Design a protein around this ligand. Structure first.
Ligand code: OIY
Length: 155
RNA sequence: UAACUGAAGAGUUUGAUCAUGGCUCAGAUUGAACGCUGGCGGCAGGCUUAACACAUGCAAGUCGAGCGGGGGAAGGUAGC
């Protein structure tokens, strides 16, 4: 189970006589064969935040139906002000995407893809958008099943 | 046989945050210029500004089988 650490930030909370500082971590876990999830963790110190983020990531996971090592069809997704576009690519292309998308795609097992961010590039929002796009991607078998047809009829 | 296959982000407003929005950076390119330095070859390129003013040499001649004159070389004959 591959685990990637997307971002770590230091945050502050004001109290009387000073500020309380903490750390937040965003992590993405995956199996490289169509299962992936992400999570966040907050703690007074970095390792505990990373562990909590990993625990949340393992709790929040989905299954993604890949077409080989690439996507089934072009995907448009958004979460808040972050919009993402993803496109299938031929073998040998690689993962042409930003780091936040790249972690999710590699953990899900995508090897060739072309991706783009529009709008805000906040790491958590971009991860949410990519996660939604991968979750909502469909496949020819599901399309044929829902239309009451055969995959050869669907083409 | 083949003639196309293609899209990455980062920094910076706040005690944290998310958004909006400018500014800045990583690329490719050049008839370039300047600074430091400098061995060779091949192939290209070389006043982007004053269509400002130009010394000097050269860059449009050739035909005597179109024509009449006119020149200067030799030869031969003659004499002394
Ligand atoms: N917001 C705070 C509200 C406070 C407000 N004051 C309330 C109030 O005043 N009156 C009450 C009125 C309530 C209202 N009638 C119900 C309502 O809001 N319906 C709409 C919201 C649906 C649902 N509730 C939220 C939801 O499904 N989120 C998921 C979630 O975050 C996460 O997936 C999971 N599973 O974890 C993520 C992928 O990681 O996908 C998100 N999905 C999405 N992201 C996308 C996005 O942004 N745009 C476009 C589309 O693509 C979106 N879908």
């Amino acid at each position: 189970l591959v685990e990637k650490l997307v971002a770590v930030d230091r945050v502050a909370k004001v109290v009387k006589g000073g500020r309380i500082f903490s750390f937040t971590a965003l992590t993405v876990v995956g199996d490289g064969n169509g299962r992936v999830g992400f999570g966040r963790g907050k703690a007074r110190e970095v390792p505990a935040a990373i562990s909590k983020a990993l625990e949340a990531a393992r709790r929040n996971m989905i299954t993604v139906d890949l077409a080989g090592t690439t996507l089934q069809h072009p995907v448009n997704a958004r979460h808040g002000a972050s919009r993402v576009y993803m496109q299938p690519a031929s073998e040998g292309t690689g993962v042409i995407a930003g780091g936040a998308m790249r972690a999710v795609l590699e953990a899900a097992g995508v090897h060739n893809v072309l991706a783009k961010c529009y709008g805000s590039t906040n790491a958590a929002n971009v991860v949410n958008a990519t996660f939604k796009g991968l979750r909502d991607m469909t496949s020819p078998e599901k399309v044929a099943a829902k239309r009451g047809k055969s995959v050869e009829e669907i083409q």
